[PDB]
Curated annotation (Swiss-Prot), chains A, B:
Expressed in erythroid tissues. It comes from Homo sapiens. This is Hemoglobin subunit mu. Heme b binds at H54, H83. Keywords: Heme, Iron, Metal-binding, Oxygen transport, Transport. Belongs to the globin family.
Length: 137, 137
């Protein structure tokens, strides 16, 4: 449950990502793989231009989720099935990705990525992660 | 157990912090308080110049720990007693601080804070946190 101010804040973060999905997503994956090498097993194909492609897909889906905070479970249902049932992504990986995403955004946006924006963004992404992991057995 | 390359990497990170302990530490606390408001209960006195003072103390201790990775338990013993026994800081707060610290460093250092440096820094700070929490009952 995001407040109106929090929804405005995550829209502001997204406006700073739009157009950079591939580059920011590739850097997110690189940071995740280096700081948490256990995550590399999920991406044997990516383990450099293929990084840009997957990064683009991933962050484009994040942008779509911003437009659907009120019905995230319905809108993300295919992606939830994919991560929980088909890919079998251990839910513990999702906080590692979210923390890594904050670092990449801070590196590019510096003080434009304010602590208020980070709090809202973290709440939003934690909710996305719940949807993408709750079907995991 | 940090490798020689990892020790070189954390020395490089510290060289980029030195002189900015107060400012970076204050921003670390502000980010921690905003993204994780549950942490504010530990700092009723700080909850703005007092932020600079505490930030300075905290990050100066980090710098001292860099010089003592081989005998962290002995060198940090007073600080371990303080956090675990006197302040009773719940160990779950330490990952929140470490993640917040990466974000603050990225915001200021941008791509100079490389993913290799972050991996080494994270390993180092996770070890500091183990020392500062293992006495907690
Ligand atoms: C907010 C969190 C996440 C979002 C929005 C997201 C989004 C996506 C999307 C849209 C795809 C489709 C790629 C395609 O069909 O080409 C995908 C695939 C994939 N995701 Fe995620 N993902 C997230 C978290 C994770 C995490 C934490 C992991 C593992 C650590 C992961 C591992 C994978 C893998 C292995 C694939 C398949 C890649 C491929 O087949 O090329 N994802 N993800
Ligand atoms: C790498 C991790 C940490 C380091 C190196 C560190 C370092 C320090 C130092 C050097 C002091 C002494 C301040 C003084 O005597 O004036 C201190 C005090 C304190 N620390 Fe930490 N700290 C760490 C983590 C934490 C965390 C995670 C919390 C709580 C969320 C915390 C809460 C406190 C509090 C409440 C004080 C007392 C402040 C005061 O009395 O003014 N510390 N810390």
């Amino acid at each position: 449950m995001l407040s109106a101010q929090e929804r405005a804040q995550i829209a502001q973060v997204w406006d700073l990502i739009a157009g950079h999905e591939a580059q920011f997503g590739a850097e997110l994956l690189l940071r995740l793989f280096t700081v948490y090498p256990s995550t590399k097993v999920y991406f044997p194909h990516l383990s450099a231009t293929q990084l840009l492609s997957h990064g683009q897909r991933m962050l484009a889906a994040v942008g779509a989720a911003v437009q659907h905070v009120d019905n995230l479970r319905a809108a993300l249902s295919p992606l939830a099935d994919l991560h929980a049932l088909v890919l079998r992504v251990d839910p513990a990986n999702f906080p590692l990705l979210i923390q890594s995403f904050h670092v990449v955004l801070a590196s590019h946006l510096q003080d434009e990525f304010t602590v208020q924006m980070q709090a809202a963004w973290d709440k939003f992404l934690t909710g996305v992660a719940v949807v993408l992991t709750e079907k995991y057995r």
